[PDB]
Design a protein around this nucleic acid. Structure first.
Ligand code: UTP
Ligand code: DGP
Ligand code: MG
Ligand code: ZN
Lengths: 1135, 542, 145, 41, 74
RNA sequence: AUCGAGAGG
DNA sequence: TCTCTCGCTGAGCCTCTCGAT
DNA sequence: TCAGCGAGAGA
């Protein structure tokens, strides 16, 4: 297989043995398709926006001989693009123009938020993600109470008809063996009442269900239900149903029938969706799978008959927690639902206005008011339970958040309502939902992550690919199978061996059928899996040697990989899985090449590519201009940066990585650093799970990170003592004023320490950095003052140079009024006014950049669930050293390997030692300026190692410069890739170690740094990949002595932001009581808080050196007494 | 002020739930006042009396009459009776638990250089916790004339401030508590020492009481203020007093992990080591020989040791004798206090042996010798565990050859059970029980066989003849120690992983006949995920 | 300065005695100005002055003048903390039943009177409270006991 | 409501009765003070 | 010795909860009053001087009550 | 101060 | 005298971040 | 939602 140049620079060795047929699909596809359906123009009108418009319209006008008709809709060009929306802080949305005729004009119907290329919306300058929802599909479901309803223990079967939109409907039993129909989960009534309501006489009811009642094969439940039935006429049943629905319950004949009709048999009030209709017919065994949305009496009779049969024992009860019963609603469907709700709300007012007669004056634009539609859309995009804040720690975090599915949200389970069955996994989760990746808090089991190959059907049911098996030979075509269809067939295992012809070598092959795994003959197999990594999600597939870890530790490692902070200098993982490239490319943090060509110009902030001849358009200039992102904060205050990874004149193909985003290294995902770890106890500085770190790691800034913080100063409008921004500050030093400019705003690039003035104290606590960016917004109409005049001048001067930079390069490849007109509007944007919240004079935003370096108290971790806290920064002369004199970077405790069952870290340590041995050999060969032939020989001998490898890299095709560049990039260690469940075996690791002239066992003799004496036993040392999680002791440390207090209960507030104290809860009070500590409790209940006079008296006493307290009565008791007295109950203190 | 109109940054003012309920009640009452004055018909006057009753219902104990009143959003309003009952009521949020001043919170590290009654805290925490004391003593020394000047000196952080702080925190104890205070030992008083950093340093022996690890776990610190509080912390709260748990007679401060790892390695013997068969003057010569390298730590030697006993009435009497021991035991003998028998250290010291030794020291001598002995034990265990250089490797885990044999016989048995169930002689539940029993027996058998192979299989030669001995394998030492790990972890590392259990019950799908040394396949891992889900759900929901 | 807590029912005269301010007619809260509106849920005459040692009317603002009523508004000058103590009352045109006694337990009114909870529930909701009050006044405890 | 109906009385004998109102609990070092108060009565 | 453990200090009194003797009277009269410590200070803060005094055997409830009676007379 | 959503122990 | 529907009570602790009312 | 408990229903 030929290699792309970005792949050609550094080729990661593969140990996989199973050939792969299906390439990894686009990861974010699930978030891109659905929203596309929401905005694409469909002539059939089946999909979201046009379907909603067609369903709501036309307007009948209520017999007034008027009508309203619409032709089509279009999406206008957005006012701003993504970036300006991010800076100014407005929503990235497009206007929705729809053209209508009245029986012609375009009417504005609000603005629809748009999805960016990655798949994240911009709502108020902050990127947000709408999570897919896993909810039970509309249709009919038969369930049982499992005998726990009553002490008798008899199973109480029931049936439920869940609509996509409408009211529920239930048929259930009682231990008396009688039907009972429940509407909207209200009180029970005899079911035959509804049969009365449907124009059925008693004779017809008895004729429908009977032919003759026996003991086991048939049951006289209908007769008993009719006997219990109080009503006999249709009108009485209808008025009783009305009384159930309406507590007041006036008789009002000719109105109850309207209620019963509109309850279930009206399109505008009740609708069973096409998926619901299909599931309904499939459950009730009907050949046709399309029909009317509204329910029908035949359906009610048939579902009642099916429930009677299931109770009788003819059928089988369904399983609620089956992935063929649950379906996924993405962002497009939810947005369509909300927009339809808004359209109904507005059409109500359209009918109301059309009721009155207006001739020659009414216009289509005039009647429609878009405010409710805009309000509903805005509420959904910004206040829903599924429109969550983005996770922007690293690309893996972004992808995992975007590929999440939640069982919560509207029309879904609540945390308390969830049992112990919805949290457990199901045998149908294989290949559709990851069994590993899940939270550990209250939400476990209720939130999942999509599998790598998982796909969604047109209805919404998850399906997974499989390879067809024909005539006992495995073929290459793939079919996508859903949950229902999988059971009927038999599926072979991905680990089965082949013969290069498709024939199964094994006589009996492992397979899974109907949810159970067993051996099957060769001829019976009908399908096969595509890859060994088909089960795990992306995060779980990024863990090497996953098959050797305990599922708990794999879960913890997958969760912690999403918390790693992007370091200062990215470093590739020496041992990986080969899935890093896909994640890095599909994340969207990198800059990929749209078209091939040659890099004409490279810079720290721009790239210009000269496109090849055959790719350019006939009229296009033929250049591609990429602008990079430099030092912009993320949601979690981390740093987002892009660095070019190409030089002048390099050839570029399609899809090559031009620039590397955060936590990326030449188009690969790089989350942490490689460290030399030795597993041994060292004077108890790694006692429980602590980590001992050398001083070289701190010296080389291997874990230094950049954090960017945003601070805002807003000058409010007040009649008395109005706020101002000016350098004049009463009672301040000369230096503090000097650091400020004439305008009173801090100079860009200045170094500020905690307690300094940014805008004329404001920089908080101990965090200190450099001012990298200052933005200013002023209310429209008010003229800018001082510095803001210069800021817009520099922006305007740069804006001309910015755009003219593309104008000059574009003109280099190749009347003038077409382009300059855009410049005038671009010039207006900076100079014009800006939107601000009412009651605000001006707002200045300042960004600070702080470099955080590791110190004791910082949590660090690995990829196998092994976390810890740095306990000591040991000097270099104290670390244990090898015979050659090279010290180790990290010492880890071997206590945590047996109990915390992750041998994966040991295997990764051995393989990393082998890889770094190969890299050291290559570096030694390269430093002596040996001949290129020896480099070719050694590299080829290294690459050809293995038992039966699928990679087959040949260096004969490589030229001298190519192999020289590859060797230069391979000097720090040859990377190795092990697939998730088909990876390197122990024998191959031993052979690779033997090739690099290192001990086979993987353990070497170490020497004590302090005494220079040999350790008694050999020590396991190697290279392992470590991450720095985003839990830094710099932020968790807090302390309080005396600050501000709450209002109603005079106690200190809670939280580090408000400078509040810690909480002394009930259990601590119980502990103090158990010790018998009576004075400490009395001071922690009265003096330390909640007593107004005790605090001041004790503070004065402590200041004066007297440690004596005079406790009183807490204010909380006073407020309790006052509120109880307010409630109307007299309570008082008697003496 | 009990229902505040809290000010807001913007023009609008936030409104509590009580104010609007009172407003509605006043509205309905005033409607009834004017309407009855106008002599309205009896039919209409009765209607809003029901509304007034409903409003009074809503004002106090809302939601009992059904259809609880909702405000702007779809959330029921909060009534007077909701400020009393519930988790967020005044009883269980502001009276049985409060938020206290003079306190802080931070992460915890190990710092194994401390004594049993000491904890290390950062300077930046102390300078904030002890501000009033610093103000008072700055006024006393005459450096400042008012409170404001001393305050400014505190922000400026001069050297006088650091000297005063060093003087202030000399003997005030501080209370450290973790987040879940399950029992009485969850909060303890320590004597503080200033350290440079941002994390609190906690004595290694105390951790087992707190259930406190160092995986980013945090802790909270409070400072006693008054004289009686200081004495209360010193006499009843200090960690030196809490030697025994209140639930039973066993002690709480028991060496674990690395300490035991060093200790039994010191005390374990080997055959034909370097320096075996030598006579020594005492423990000092043993230490000199070990540090010089003339003899091994596991050599079997004879030492002339002297032991004190308290068998005499209220007195100590000595006896000296030649005893056959090992060198490491001779060094270990040098830290035990006067008045204990030798046989407490003439054996391989597991966790149980060390705990029993501490219990005996407390029973016989007292409390101060017990504290000193615990500190010495921790120091010696750490030092010799470090010098041990014991590591875990992939070649350490060993797999036997009887495992596949017994798995095959168990598979034959379960196949016969399936054949029996295929016939109508037996039901489903009985077959389920039979299969689960068979597989449990097979798992026990494989665990026994593998542990036997790990334990016994070490052969060394003495003067040219073979002999067997207890293994020095790292994994077997880790398991036999009791420091961390059990027989289940080792058996799952070198036998069958066993039978998994769903959150409700057990599952008998297949035998997972694959170690963690030789990797699992996809089906076995999918089966194994059930137990992980069950464990996490059980924890978080029980 | 106390040794016991005594809890009992509150008579209407006791509630009327608790109030420091006259009445609660006007339903208003604030926003006529930044000063609180007269007789409102946040008031000056009823619940005390809002500013320490200063009256709302602004006649005097000195602690040497403490203990004097106001002339423009009639609000006595006192430390603002007293706003955490004072109370007031609302007079209902028609008596209203306390939900705590009628519900949330075996009904106390339902055990004073023999008829079950449903009858009293339908009587209160007009499907009146004055009738229940008259019935509760009608009985004599010793005779029925 | 039962206490209000019955007109009960609380002597503040236990632990939470003193903790809620902010006094010395009748155990440990507060036992002597409680005993002195009882003996005075 | 005395700073680490108070077992010898409580052996003289016999009741651990009777620390009111050490704190409420001795340490207070040392800190606020003009009373001079008996044993040498050794730069120790108060409340450790008193514990040392009870440990050796100069301070107990009867002795402090007797002394209080002595200063009662004029 | 609430609500919603995450996260840690 | 007693077996059954219907209602109301409860469901661990501490800490951090963001947005939106 | 599951799991119990007391008062009220007829049978
Ligand atoms: O929901 C929770 C989770 C955790 N905890 C508290 O954290 C502890 C579990 O979380 P830890 O991860 O800190 O303890 P661990 O040592 O058992 O886990 P590993 O290092 O082996 O990975 C618990 O013992 C408890 O103190 C809770 O109190 N509630
Ligand atoms: N904390 C806070 N509450 C607000 C703010 N604006 C309004 N509220 C509260 C006051 C009312 O309870 C409610 C009014 O919301 P309305 O705009 O739907 O929300 C605000 O900026 N901050
Ligand atoms: Mg922990
Ligand atoms: Zn006045």
């Amino acid at each position: 297989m030929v290699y792309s140049y970005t792949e050609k620079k550094r080729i990661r060795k593969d140990f996989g043995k199973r050939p792969q047929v299906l390439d990894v699909p686009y990861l974010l596809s699930i978030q891109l398709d659905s929203f596309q359906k929401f905005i694409e123009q469909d002539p059939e009108g089946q999909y979201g926006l046009e379907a909603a418009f067609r369903s709501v319209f036309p307007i009948q006008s209520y017999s007034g001989n008027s009508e309203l008709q619409y032709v089509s809709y279009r999406l206008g060009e957005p006012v701003f693009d993504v970036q300006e929306c991010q800076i100014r802080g407005v929503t990235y949305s497009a206007p929705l123009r729809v053209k209508l005729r009245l029986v012609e004009q375009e009417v504005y119907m609000g603005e629809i938020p748009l999805m960016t290329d990655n798949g994240t919306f911009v709502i108020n300058g902050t990127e947000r993600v709408i999570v897919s929802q896993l909810h039970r599909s509309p249709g009919v479901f038969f369930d049982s109470d499992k005998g726990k309803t009553h002490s008798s223990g008899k199973v109480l079967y029931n049936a439920r008809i869940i609509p996509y939109r409408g009211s529920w409907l239930d048929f259930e039993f009682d231990p008396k063996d009688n039907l009972f129909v429940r509407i909207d989960r209200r009180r029970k009534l005899p079911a035959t009442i509804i049969l009365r309501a449907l124009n059925y006489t008693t004779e017809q009811i008895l004729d429908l269900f009977f032919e003759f009642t026996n003991d086991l094969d048939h049951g006289p439940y209908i007769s008993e239900t009719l006997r219990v039935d109080p009503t006999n006429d249709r009108l009485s049943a209808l008025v009783e149903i009305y009384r159930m629905m309406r507590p007041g319950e006036p008789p009002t004949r000719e109105a109850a029938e309207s209620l019963f009709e509109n309850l279930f048999f009206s399109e505008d009030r009740y609708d069973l969706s096409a998926v619901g209709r299909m599931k309904f017919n499939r459950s009730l065994l009907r050949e046709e799978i399309e029909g009317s949305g509204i329910l029908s009496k035949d359906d009610i009779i048939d579902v009642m008959k099916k429930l009677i049969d299931i109770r009788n024992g003819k059928g089988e009860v369904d399983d609620i927690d089956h992935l063929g019963n649950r379906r996924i609603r993405s962002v497009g469907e939810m947005a369509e639902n909300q927009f339809r709700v808004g359209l109904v709300r507005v059409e109500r007012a359209v009918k109301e206005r059309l009721s009155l007669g207006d001739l020659d004056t009414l216009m289509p634009q005039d009647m429609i008011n878009a405010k409710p539609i805009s309000a509903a859309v805005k509420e959904f995009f910004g206040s829903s339970q599924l429109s969550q804040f983005m996770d922007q720690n690293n690309p893996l975090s972004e992808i995992t958040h975007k590929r999440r599915i939640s069982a919560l949200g509207p029309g879904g389970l609540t945390r308390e309502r969830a049992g112990f069955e919805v949290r457990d996994v199901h045998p149908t989760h294989y290949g559709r939902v990851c069994p590993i990746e899940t939270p550990e808090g209250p939400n476990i089991g209720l939130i999942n992550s999509l599998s790598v190959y998982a796909q969604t059907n047109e209805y919404g049911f998850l399906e997974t690919p499989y390879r067809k098996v024909t005539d006992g030979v495995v073929t290459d075509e793939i079919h996508y199978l859903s949950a229902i269809e999988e059971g009927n067939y038999v599926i072979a295992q991905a680990n089965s061996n082949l013969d290069e012809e498709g024939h199964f070598v094994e006589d009996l092959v492992t397979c899974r059928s109907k949810g159970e795994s067993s051996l099957f003959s060769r001829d019976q197999v009908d399908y096969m899996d595509v890859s060994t990594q088909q089960v795990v999600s992306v995060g779980a597939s990024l863990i090497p040697f996953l098959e050797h870890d305990d599922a708990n530790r794999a879960l913890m490692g997958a969760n912690m990989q999403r918390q790693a902070v992007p370091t200062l200098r990215a470093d590739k993982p020496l041992v990986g899985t080969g899935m890093e490239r896909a994640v890095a490319v599909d994340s969207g943090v990198t800059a990929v090449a749209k078209r091939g060509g040659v890099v004409q110009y490279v810079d720290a902030s721009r790239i210009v590519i000269k496109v090849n001849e055959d790719e350019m358009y006939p009229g296009e200039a033929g250049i591609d201009i990429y602008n990079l992102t430099k030092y912009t904060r993320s949601n979690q205050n981390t740093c987002i940066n892009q660095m070019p990874c190409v030089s002048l004149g390099e050839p570029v193909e399609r899809g090559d990585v031009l620039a590397d985003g955060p936590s990326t290294d030449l188009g690969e995902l790089a989350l942490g650093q490689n460290m030399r770890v030795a597993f041994m106890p060292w004077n108890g500085y790694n006692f429980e799970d602590s980590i001992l770190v050398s001083e070289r790691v701190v010296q080389e800034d291997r874990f230094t990170t950049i954090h960017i913080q945003e601070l805002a100063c807003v000058s409010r409008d007040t009649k008395l003592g109005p706020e101002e921004i000016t350098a004049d500050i009463p009672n301040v030093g000369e230096a503090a004023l000097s650091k400020l400019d004439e305008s009173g705003i801090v100079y860009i690039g200045a170094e500020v320490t905690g307690g300094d003035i940014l805008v004329g104290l404001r920089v908080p606590n101990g965090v200190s950095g450099t001012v990298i960016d200052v933005q200013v917004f002023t209310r429209d109409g008010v003229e800018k003052d001082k510095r803001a005049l210069e800021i817009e001048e520099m922006q305007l001067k740069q804006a001309k140079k910015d755009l003219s930079e593309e104008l000059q390069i574009l003109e280099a490849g190749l009347l003038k009024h077409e382009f300059e007109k855009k410049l005038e509007a671009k010039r207006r944007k900076i100079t014009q006014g800006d939107d601000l919240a009412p009651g605000v004079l001006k707002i200045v935003k300042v960004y600070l950049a702080v470099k955080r370096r590791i110190q004791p108290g910082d949590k660090m971790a690995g990829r196998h669930g092994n976390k810890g806290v740095i306990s000591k920064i040991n000097p270099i002369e104290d670390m244990p050293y090898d015979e050659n004199g090279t010290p180790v970077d990290i010492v880890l405790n071997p206590l945590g390997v047996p109990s915390r069952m992750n041998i994966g870290q040991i295997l990764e340590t051995h393989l990393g030692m082998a890889a770094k041995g190969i890299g050291d050999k290559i570096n030694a060969m390269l430093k002596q300026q040996q001949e290129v032939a020896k480099l070719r020989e050694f590299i080829q001998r290294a690459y050809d190692l293995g038992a039966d490898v699928r990679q087959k890299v040949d260096l004969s095709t490589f030229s001298d410069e190519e192999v020289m560049r590859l060797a230069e990039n391979l000097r720090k260690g040859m990377p190795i890739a092990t697939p998730v469940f088909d990876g390197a075996k122990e024998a191959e690791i031993k052979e690779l170690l033997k090739l690099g002239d290192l001990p086979t066992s993987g353990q070497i003799r170490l020497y004590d740094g302090r005494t220079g004496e040999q350790f008694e036993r050999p020590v396991t040392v190697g290279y392992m990949y470590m991450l720095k999680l985003n839990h830094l002791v710099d932020d968790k440390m807090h302390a309080r002595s005396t600050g501000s207090y709450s209002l109603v209960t005079q106690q200190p507030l809670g939280g580090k932001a408000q400078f509040g104290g810690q909480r002394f809860g009930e259990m601590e009070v119980w502990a103090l009581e158990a010790y018998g500590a009576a004075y400490t409790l009395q001071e922690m209940l009265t003096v330390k808080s909640d007593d107004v006079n005790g605090r001041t008296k004790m503070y004065k006493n402590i200041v004066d050196g007297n440690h004596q307290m005079e406790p009183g009565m807490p204010e909380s008791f006073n407020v309790l007494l006052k509120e109880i007295r307010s409630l109307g109950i007299n309570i008082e203190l008697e003496d | 002020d009990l229902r505040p109109l809290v000010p807001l940054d913007g023009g609008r003012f936030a409104t509590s739930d009580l104010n609007d309920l009172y407003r509605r009640v006043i509205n309905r009452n005033n409607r009834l006042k004017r309407l009855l004055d106008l002599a309205a018909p009896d039919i209409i006057v009765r209607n809003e009396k029901r509304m007034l009753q409903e409003a009074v219902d809503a004002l106090l104990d809302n939601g009992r009459r059904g259809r609880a009143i909702t405000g702007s959003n779809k959330r029921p309003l909060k009534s007077l009776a909701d400020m009393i009952k519930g988790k967020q009521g005044r009883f269980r949020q502001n009276l049985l638990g409060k938020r206290v001043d003079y306190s802080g919170r931070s992460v915890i590290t190990v710092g194994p250089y401390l004594r049993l009654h000491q904890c290390g805290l950062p300077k930046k925490m102390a300078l904030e916790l002890f501000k009033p004391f610093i103000y008072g003593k700055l006024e006393l020394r005459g450096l400042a004339t008012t409170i404001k000047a001393a305050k400014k000196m505190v922000e400026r952080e001069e050297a006088v401030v650091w000297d005063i702080l060093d003087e202030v925190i000399r003997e005030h104890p501080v209370l450290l508590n973790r987040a879940p205070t399950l029992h009485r030992l969850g909060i303890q008083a320590f004597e503080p020492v200033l350290i440079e950093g941002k994390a609190i340093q906690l004595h290694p022996l105390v951790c087992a009481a707190y259930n406190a690890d160092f995986d980013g776990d945090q802790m909270a610190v409070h400072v006693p203020l008054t004289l009686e509080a200081q004495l209360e912390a010193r006499a009843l709260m200090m960690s030196t007093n809490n030697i025994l748990s209140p639930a039973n007679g066993e002690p709480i401060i028991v060496p674990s992990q690395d300490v035991v790892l060093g200790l039994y390695y010191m005390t374990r013997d080997c055959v034909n080591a370097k320096g075996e068969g030598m006579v020594l003057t005492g423990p000092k010569e043993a230490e000199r020989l070990y540090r010089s390298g003339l003899a091994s730590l596991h050599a079997r030697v004879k030492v002339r040791i002297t032991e004190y006993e308290k068998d005499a009435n209220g007195e100590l009497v000595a006896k000296t004798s030649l005893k056959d021991t090992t060198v490491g035991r001779a060094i270990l003998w040098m830290i035990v206090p006067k008045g204990l028998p030798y046989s407490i250290v003439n054996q391989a010291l597991g966790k149980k042996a060390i705990s029993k030794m501490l219990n005996t020291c407390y029973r016989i001598l007292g409390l101060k010798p017990t504290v000193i002995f615990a500190d010495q034990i921790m120091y010696t265990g750490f030092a010799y565990a470090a010098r041990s250089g014991a590591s875990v490797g992939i070649d350490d885990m060993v797999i036997p050859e009887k495992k596949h044999e017994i798995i095959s016989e168990a598979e034959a048995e379960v196949a016969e059970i399936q054949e029996q169930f295929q016939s109508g002689l037996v039901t489903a539940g009985e077959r389920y029980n039979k299969v689960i029993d068979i597989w449990a027996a097979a798992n026990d058998r494989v665990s026994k066989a593998m542990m036997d192979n790990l334990q016994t299989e070490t052969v060394i030669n003495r003067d040219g003849q073979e002999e067997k001995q207890v293994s020095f394998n790292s994994i077997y030492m880790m398991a036999d120690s009791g420091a961390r790990g059990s027989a289940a972890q080792i058996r799952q590392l070198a036998g069958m992983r066993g039978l998994m259990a769903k959150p409700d019950g057990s599952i008998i799908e297949t035998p997972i006949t694959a170690n963690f040394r030789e990797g699992l396949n996809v089906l076995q891992y999918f089966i194994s995920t059930h137990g992980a889900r069950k464990g996490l759900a059980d924890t978080a929901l029980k | 300065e106390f040794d016991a807590i005594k809890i009992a029912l509150a008579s209407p005269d006791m509630i009327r005695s608790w109030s420091f301010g006259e009445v609660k007619k006007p339903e208003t809260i604030n926003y006529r100005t930044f000063k609180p509106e007269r007789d409102g849920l946040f008031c000056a005459r009823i619940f005390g002055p809002v500013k320490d040692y200063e009256c709302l009317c602004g006649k005097y603002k000195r602690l040497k003048h403490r203990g004097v009523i106001c002339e423009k508004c009639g609000v006595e000058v006192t430390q603002t903390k007293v706003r955490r103590e004072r109370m007031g009352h609302i007079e209902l045109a028609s008596p209203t039943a306390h939900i705590w006694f009628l519900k949330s337990l075996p009904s106390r009114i339902g055990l004073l009177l023999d008829m079950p909870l449903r009858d009293i529930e339908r009587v209160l909701y007009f499907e009146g409270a004055e009738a229940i009050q008259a019935l509760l006044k009608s009985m004599d405890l010793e005779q029925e006991c | 409501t039962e206490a209000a109906v019955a007109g009960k009385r609380d002597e503040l004998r236990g632990l939470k009765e003193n903790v809620i109102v902010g006094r010395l609990i009748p155990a440990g070092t507060g036992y002597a003070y409680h005993q002195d108060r009882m003996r005075r009565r | 010795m005395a700073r680490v453990t108070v077992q010898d200090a409580v052996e003289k009194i016999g009741n651990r909860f009777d620390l009111v003797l050490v704190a409420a009277r001795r340490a207070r009269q040392m800190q606020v009053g003009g009373k001079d410590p008996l044993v040498p200070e050794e730069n120790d803060k108060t409340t450790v001087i008193a514990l040392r005094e009870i440990e050796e055997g100069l301070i107990n409830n009867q002795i402090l009550d007797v002394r209080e009676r002595q200063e009662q007379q004029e």
